[PDB]
Structures are given as structure tokens and as C-alpha cells.
């Protein structure tokens, strides 16, 4: 069974991709969807199997790489952390598959699309079920190849081809650092298996753990889209909406977080990386909360919301409460997938327009979508007793619960980042559903009012909700977004819970802050995020509905003109990357090609020896005039030079100077 969870998504991908002609769009959709539905059911069972019974499962198939001290197997371990990740990965993958039957119905290439969906699920399973870091890297690269294949699904569009280059190469930068980090592990311990690395971790050189932890963290920025290497994640919104719901906001983005959570038995022995994890987390939350409030694309806002939540989990990891980060990771993939599938539904209704400035009303036209995205937005802001309430609000009070400067700092930073989250959540829900209509009448012209006479049969197209294959995922994910946090709060938060007591999430007694977070933190800071959400939400509603002039005053002031464009342009990080990193590399390639390879390497080489020697040989060849009188003089000359050399006992070097002088005199013309 366990090895069958791994195998099923792979087989459905192969049928849809290499045999799409035989099965057709219907047969590809059925085999692809059914295989991942079956895998999802087998994985829910494996959660009861492994986690609730504390029975880890080991299976090794054959060796991959065999050398001295290097034995890396095609082996898989199922523990409490593995089955925890598999549930959001396979529930969301199953639902996005069912969703994609309705969303991609009109597209010409459905077999290729559904094949890439199953290929992504297979690779994500490989990433969380591996025995060792090198097989986890296969899923890491595999998910990257699948994200490139899905961002660039519409290859005809150049924008898509630029954005897929960004995703591929910004993730290769993280891969370089993981490869260095895995080299460090092999160099120190001789093998990179999890049992080996974690059993020996308490004793390794403390500075060796620094090198591995930094390399593991740098690799984690690229995939988890942390501020240093995050430019790719918003560009991955070029691919179709269901791709952005699973890969770009509910599964692959979390792999960086999984890498740190898996490596907890190692990075816990280096508090130096834990400060970097923590500050890395707090920066990305305010960095991306500010940007999303000034975006005009709905997908761009929901992409910048995901990076604000990924920054929350990395903050929790550096806070040294891994069960909290795992709890947020699973809870977030339910409501972030909901908002993306809900946004995808309004894009479908409004003729593929993705701009808030052209959406209005629509609340009466898309009632289910509005309520469902209201479900998602209340857990995104962690409204009390929602699924996101138990995960996001425990990260905040755990930051203040570690009574340190860095903890109180990140609490202030993260709380401000939460304020801007509430602002762009109102923006999305107000401008798409609650504001006056800002788009053409075609989305709002019904048949109850007669605008036509001889064309009443057709041509109204008034923004209707989709079909069963579209709404069904949205309803299910809504139920998760309301109740999943409560029903699983003990498995993850607990107080002395033993769910991860198979060393899947190792907390060192020195770093435990759980008891203080339960008792030490004052009620004011415990309740503080709630008042801010309720107060800002009403303030932004009035400034968007009642008092709409004031924001016009801000953006028409030169101060606010610069502040609006600064955050709209994403801190100008894209600007400085193309101009000083990307273009710098393309100039360097040109200078090597133009001035060195085709320049001085051929001048101080074959071409300069060619043109130099041909000139020399013509001059010496011009000494031969076929005159016996002049040839006789040469013999006497060459006779005397031999007599001088072997009678004046001259230094042999004096001769070589003569030859080099003579040769270079024939090198000069005229």
C-alpha cells in the first residue's frame, strides 16, 4: 500500500502524456483524476496507520548511488511528519484535478495539462517520503521541472516564457546551495540518510552545523519564496489558475518549509540559523503584505498573500516551534487553495479579466463564490475560531512568548504585517463583489430587462457561476476552512502531545517556549491581533465605500505618488535584478565572446601567428632572386658567421639574440 501511494499518480501521468491519443480528453481526465483520488484515499488511511499508532514504515527498493561511504537508496520512510504533509498535498491535488475539468474544458490541450498535474503530485510525494536528502532533492528538482512545465503551459505567450525562466533559474540558485549543503553533510558524516544525520547531529562540530544550516536555509528561500529569492513566485501567476492553486500556493511553496521541519533534529543544534530563520520570516511577512495592498491583479494579490504566510512558517521555525509551523502549513493549503479557486471562478465569469478596476457588483451574480471567499478571507485574517485562527495567532503569541528582543521585535513586525493583510483582504472582497460595477455592462446585463429585440435567444453573457466540477471543490474546501483547525488542534498544538515523538519534529528542551506561551503572554497581546483586524477592516471599508475621496488625495500627492508606486513596483527588487544582475551577466557573456574568444585569444594565438608568419615568410622568400652573384655573397656571409662564432668563443646566447633580431627584421615590411 505504502509504495502504491507513490506509484499511482505516476502511472496516470504516463497514460495521459504518452497515450493521450488513445484515451482522449475524457479518458485522460478520468484516469488522471481517478488515480489521484485513489491515492488520496490510501493516504488518509496511512495517516491513521502511521501517526495515530506511532508506527513508522520503512521500505527500501534498490540502491541509487553506491560508492565508498556513499549508499543512497530508492527508499521511503513514512513517519508522523510524512503523513502530515501528504494530506494537504493529496486532498488539494485531488480537488484541483476535479476543478480543472470545468476550468480547462475549452482549452485545446487537456491531455498535456492533466499529465503535468499528475506529474507534479508524483514529484511532491517523492519529496516528502524519501529516506535521504538526495532522494528528497529528486522531488525538489522534479517539482521545479513541473512548475516550469505548468507556468509555460501556453508557450505561445512570451510573458509566460519569461516567467517560467524566472521560476526555473531562481530555484536553481537555491539548488546550488542545497547541493553545497548536502556536500557538507556527506563530507562530515559520510552519508546523507535522515537516521544517520539526526542520530549523529548532537555531536558534530558546531561550526559544521552552521554551514549545513545556512545552506539548507538559502535553498529554502527560493522554494518558499522568502524575500531574498522571491521574485519568481508572483510571476508564476502566468500559468493557468488551477496550477497557481496547487503548485504556487498550496504545495511546492511549502517544500522549503518542509526541508527545515524535516531537518529539525539537525538545525536545532545551531541557534545561529534559528535567528536567521526567524528574521527571514518576519521580513517576508511585511515585505509581501505591503506589496499585495497596492496590486491591481487579483492573482498577484493572492500570490503575495501566500508569501506572507510562508514568512509566518519560517518565523515559527526560527522560533523553534515546528509543530506550530506544520499546523500553519496544513491549515493554509486549505484556505489559500480556496481563495485561488474562488478567484479563478470570478476570472472565468468575467471574460478572463484579472483587474479589480474592472470588477464591481457581482455579489448577486456569484453568491456562492462570494461567501466561499468570505470563508477563506476570515481564516486568512485569522478571525476567531476559524481554521487559520489556531495556526496564525499561535505564531504571534509564541513570538512574544519567547521573551527575547528578537521575539518581541518579530511580534511587532508580524502584527504590522497582519494589519496590511486585513487591508488587502477588504480590497479583494470589496472591489470584486461589494463596490459599484467598474466593468462593461455585458457582465451585468440580464434577460429580465430587455436590451434586445431580434437577438433575445443569445448574447447576454451575465457573469454566471460555473458547473458542478467547479463548485464541488469550493464547497469542500470551505468546510475545511471552518473546522479543520479545531478538529486537529490537539494533534499539532497540544500541550504535551506525543504525535511527533518518533523524532520527526525534535525540539530541544532549551528552546521550548510552549508553557510560557500558554501562561506568560499577557491577554492584551494575546487579543491584540483581533482588535486590529476588526478596527482596520471597518476603517478600510469606510475609506473604500463611504469616504472614497481621501485615497484619491493620497495618490495625487507627490508623497503618496511615490509610496504607491514603490509598493506597486514590489520594492523595485525586479528593477535592480534585471539591471544589475541579469543584464550584467549578459554583458559579461558578450565581452568574453566579443573581446576575448573572437578577440585577443585569436590575435594572441592562431590568427596572429597566421598573419605574422605569412608576412615573415614572404620577406625571407624575397631574398631568393635566383642570381648566382647574390647567392655567392650569401654563402660567404654564412661562412663568416660560422667562423666568428667558433673562433671568438662568443656566448651561445649572443647567437640567439642575432636569430631573434634577424627573424623580427623580416617581420617588418618595407
Amino acid at each position: 500500500m505504502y509504495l502504491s501511494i507513490i506509484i499511482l499518480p505516476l502511472l496516470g501521468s504516463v497514460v495521459s502524456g504518452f497515450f493521450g491519443r488513445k484515451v482522449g480528453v475524457s479518458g485522460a481526465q478520468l484516469i488522471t483524476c481517478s488515480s489521484v483520488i485513489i491515492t488520496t484515499i490510501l493516504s488518509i488511511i496511512a495517516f491513521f496507520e502511521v501517526g495515530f499508532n506511532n508506527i513508522p514504515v520503512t521500505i527500501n527498493i534498490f540502491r541509487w548511488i553506491d560508492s565508498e561511504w556513499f549508499i543512497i537508496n530508492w527508499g521511503f520512510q513514512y513517519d508522523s511528519l510524512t503523513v502530515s504533509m501528504l494530506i494537504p498535498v493529496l486532498i488539494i491535488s485531488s480537488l484541483v484535478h476535479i476543478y480543472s475539468i470545468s476550468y480547462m474544458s475549452s482549452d485545446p490541450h487537456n491531455q498535456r495539462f492533466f499529465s503535468y498535474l499528475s506529474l507534479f503530485t508524483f514529484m511532491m510525494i517523492i519529496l516528502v517520503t524519501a529516506n535521504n536528502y538526495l532522494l528528497m532533492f529528486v522531488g525538489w528538482e522534479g517539482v521545479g521541472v513541473c512548475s516550469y512545465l505548468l507556468v509555460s503551459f501556453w508557450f505561445t505567450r512570451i510573458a509566460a516564457n519569461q516567467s517560467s525562466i524566472s521560476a526555473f533559474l531562481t530555484n536553481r540558485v537555491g539548488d546550488c546551495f542545497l547541493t553545497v549543503g548536502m556536500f557538507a553533510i556527506l563530507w562530515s558524516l559520510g552519508n546523507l540518510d535522515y537516521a544517520t544525520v539526526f542520530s549523529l547531529a548532537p555531536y558534530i562540530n558546531s561550526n559544521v552545523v552552521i554551514i549545513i544550516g545556512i545552506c539548507l536555509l538559502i535553498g529554502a528561500m527560493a522554494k518558499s519564496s522568502q524575500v531574498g529569492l522571491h521574485v519568481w513566485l508572483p510571476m508564476a501567476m502566468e500559468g493557468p489558475t488551477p496550477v497557481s492553486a496547487l503548485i504556487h500556493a498550496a504545495t511546492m511553496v511549502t517544500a522549503g518549509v518542509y526541508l527545515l521541519m524535516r531537518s529539525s533534529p539537525l538545525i536545532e543544534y545551531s541557534s545561529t540559523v534559528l535567528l536567521l530563520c526567524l528574521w527571514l520570516g518576519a521580513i517576508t511577512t511585511v515585505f509581501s503584505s505591503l506589496i499585495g495592498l497596492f496590486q491591481q491583479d487579483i492573482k498577484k494579490v493572492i500570490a503575495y498573500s501566500t508569501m506572507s504566510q510562508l514568512g509566518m512558517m519560517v518565523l515559527s521555525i526560527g522560533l523553534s516551534s515546528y509543530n506550530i509551523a506544520l499546523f500553519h502549513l496544513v491549515n493554509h493549503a486549505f484556505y489559500k487553495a480556496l481563495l485561488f479557486l474562488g478567484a479563478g471562478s470570478v476570472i472565468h465569469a468575467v471574460a478572463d479579466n484579472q483587474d479589480f478596476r474592472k470588477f464591481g457588483g457581482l455579489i448577486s451574480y456569484l453568491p456562492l463564490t462570494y461567501s466561499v471567499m468570505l470563508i477563506a478571507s476570515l481564516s486568512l485574517v485569522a478571525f476567531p475560531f476559524m481554521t487559520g485562527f489556531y495556526s496564525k495567532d499561535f505564531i504571534l503569541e509564541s513570538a512574544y512568548g519567547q521573551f527575547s528582543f528578537s521575539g518581541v521585535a518579530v511580534y511587532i513586525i508580524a502584527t504590522i504585517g497582519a494589519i496590511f493583510t486585513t487591508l488587502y483582504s477588504v480590497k479583494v472582497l470589496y472591489l470584486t463583489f461589494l463596490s459599484n460595477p467598474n466593468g462593461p455592462r455585458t457582465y451585468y446585463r440580464l434577460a429580465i430587462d430587455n436590451f434586445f429585440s431580434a437577438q433575445a435567444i443569445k448574447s447576454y453573457k451575465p457573469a454566471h457561476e460555473g458547473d458542478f466540477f467547479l463548485t464541488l471543490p469550493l464547497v469542500i474546501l470551505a468546510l475545511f476552512s471552518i473546522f479543520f483547525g479545531f478538529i486537529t488542534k490537539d494533534i499539532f498544538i497540544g500541550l504535551g502531545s506525543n504525535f511527533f515523538v518518533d523524532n520527526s519534529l525534535f525540539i530541544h528542551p532549551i528552546h521550548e517556549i510552549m508553557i510560557d506561551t500558554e501562561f506568560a503572554v499577557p491577554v492584551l497581546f494575546k487579543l491584540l491581533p483581533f482588535i486590529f483586524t476588526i478596527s482596520f477592516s471597518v476603517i478600510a471599508l469606510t475609506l473604500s465605500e463611504l469616504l472614497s475621496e481621501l485615497v484619491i488625495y493620497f495618490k495625487f500627492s507627490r508623497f503618496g505618488y511615490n509610496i504607491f508606486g514603490f509598493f506597486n513596483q514590489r520594492f523595485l527588487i525586479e528593477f535592480f535584478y534585471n539591471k544589475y544582475i541579469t543584464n550584467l551577466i549578459l554583458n559579461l557573456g558578450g565581452q568574453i565572446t566579443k573581446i576575448l574568444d573572437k578577440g585577443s585569444i585569436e590575435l594572441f594565438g592562431p590568427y596572429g601567428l597566421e598573419r605574422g608568419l605569412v608576412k615573415l615568410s614572404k620577406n625571407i622568400s624575397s631574398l631568393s632572386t635566383s642570381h648566382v652573384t647574390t647567392y655567392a655573397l650569401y654563402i660567404l656571409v654564412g661562412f663568416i658567421l660560422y667562423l666568428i662564432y667558433n673562433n671568438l668563443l662568443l656566448d651561445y646566447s649572443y647567437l640567439l639574440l642575432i636569430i631573434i633580431l634577424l627573424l623580427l627584421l623580416m617581420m617588418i615590411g618595407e
Binding site: 491519443r21 482522449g24 480528453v25 475524457s26 553506491d66
Partner: protein, 72 residues
Amino acid sequence: QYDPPTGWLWGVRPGEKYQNEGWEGPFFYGFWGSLIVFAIAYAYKPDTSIQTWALEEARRRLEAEGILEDPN
């Protein structure tokens, strides 16, 4: 309203058939045939790797210690 499946595999139009250029005979029977016959033979190749030899000695040294249990 899905369309019929289409295309010309190998560029052979729906009228005619694939014309054998000449390479096909040796390449399918000799080149690939040799690899399947090599694959089936490789299964019965005796294992003369250093590790199968070094594992068995290594087990007999660790069996002389509490690290590995001996069947005797």
C-alpha cells in the same frame, strides 16, 4: 465537441505506408536485439563486485563483536 484524432506519424500520409530506408533491419534486430540479449544474459552474470566480497567479510568481523548477531 471533440475533434477526431489526426496527424501523420513518421510523416506518412493517410494514403501510403512507411517505406523502409535500409537502416531499419540491422538497427531493430542487431542493435536493439543485442541489448535485450545482453540484458537477459546480465541477470545470470556472476557478481564479482568488491562490495559483495567486502560485505561478507565485514559481517564476519562485526559478528565477532556484539554489533552483528551470528547464526552460530
